Design a binder for this molecule. Structure first.
Ligand SMILES: Cn1nc(-c2ccccn2)cc1NC(=O)c1nc(C2CC2)ccc1Nc1cncnc1
Ligand SMILES: [Mg+2]
Ligand SMILES: [Zn+2]
Length: 314
């Protein structure tokens, strides 16, 4: 066989939840295949269809500041770490589908929210009236699968193929944060009451959804310098959106207004308390070995407090 291998530093550190995939774009396909060979197995996908599918996916990500090809691989790496430290809980189809869902989850993102598409009257908002962007990301995933030499799920049965596409579809839709609030409430109650059942498909669906939120936000779970530099990239997109809102003659919400640059630390504080902490808390409860995502979220929360109190710069 041919195994994929990484330099010694990468081979060890890719196992830590807080691994940063680095600034060399040409290493990222290599890193993703390695993660698939170790979580799934070297037999899950024909290497030549994978390589062709990966490079077609890369080509349909845009060069936007945050929702880009580096984000896709970073989210997949977080899923890799959740999957490797909970290896007894997931099926063969789920390992296969969820890494792929993560790589494809923001395909053809232009840096604008579902709200902007609705106010702009983008054609996609008439096609898909809710989770607009997320339904487009899936649709693009399907397009690429249906290119010649690109069906990585060729070896699967007719009914398996349909299950793995349903796993991918729900996983991608679950990255609509407007759906996370509801999904986290439900999982919290089910966990506190004792009803949560990993053999119930609609319960599996909710947990995978929560893993997808955790993976999608995992930028708040990195070493402080990575988390701080990554917040520049997200605000660059938010502020460009708020400018386009103002051009429609609409006041953007505060997080998208570049005039409120100085309230960024206070907004981060808001985001960690209302969203990130709850998220990593509930995921730790359901999946104890994902502890370090919560620990590292709390540490960066503590860092943002330092920034507000003038004991840190940004
Ligand atoms: C709710 N909210 N309010 C403010 C705010 C409010 C007022 C003033 C200034 N900012 C900012 C935000 N959201 C995020 O910061 C944020 N959102 C999202 C998902 C799109 C939702 C993902 C990540 C986020 N952060 C982040 C990402 N990657 C590294 N580090 C941090
Ligand atoms: Mg998205
Ligand atoms: Zn994303």
């Amino acid at each position: 066989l041919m195994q994929f291998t990484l330099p010694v530093r990468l081979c060890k550190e890719i196992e830590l939840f807080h691994f940063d995939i680095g600034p060399f774009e040409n290493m990222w396909p290599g890193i993703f295949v390695y993660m698939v060979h170790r979580s799934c197995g070297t037999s899950c996908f024909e290497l030549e269809k994978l390589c062709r599918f990966i490079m077609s996916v890369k080509k349909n990500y845009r060069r936007v500041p945050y929702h880009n090809w580096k984000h896709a691989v970073t989210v997949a790496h977080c899923m890799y770490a959740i999957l490797q430290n909970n290896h007894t809980l997931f099926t063969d189809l789920e390992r296969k589908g969820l890494l792929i869902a993560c790589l494809c989850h923001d395909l053809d993102h232009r840096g604008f929210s579902n709200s902007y598409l609705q106010k702009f009257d983008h054609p996609l908002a008439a096609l898909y009236s809710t989770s607009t962007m997320e339904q487009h990301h899936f649709s693009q995933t399907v397009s690429i699968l249906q290119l010649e030499g690109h069906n990585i799920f060729s070896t699967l049965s007719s009914s398996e193929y349909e299950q793995v596409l349903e796993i991918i579809r729900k996983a991608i839709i679950a990255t609509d944060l407007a759906l996370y609030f509801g999904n986290r409430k439900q999982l919290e109650e089910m966990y506190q009451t004792g009803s949560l059942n990993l053999n119930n498909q609609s319960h599996r669906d909710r947990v995978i959804g929560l893993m997808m939120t955790a993976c999608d936000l995992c930028s708040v779970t990195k070493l402080w310098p990575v988390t701080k530099l990554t917040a520049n990239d997200i605000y660059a997109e938010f502020w460009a959106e708020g400018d386009e809102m103002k051009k429609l003659g609409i006041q953007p919400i505060p997080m998208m207004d570049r005039d409120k640059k100085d309230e960024v630390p206070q907004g981060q504080l808001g985001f960690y308390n209302a969203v990130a902490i709850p998220c990593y808390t509930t995921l730790t409860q359901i999946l104890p070995p994902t502890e370090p995502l919560l620990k590292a979220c709390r540490d960066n929360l503590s860092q943002w407090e330092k920034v507000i109190r003038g004991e840190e710069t940004a």
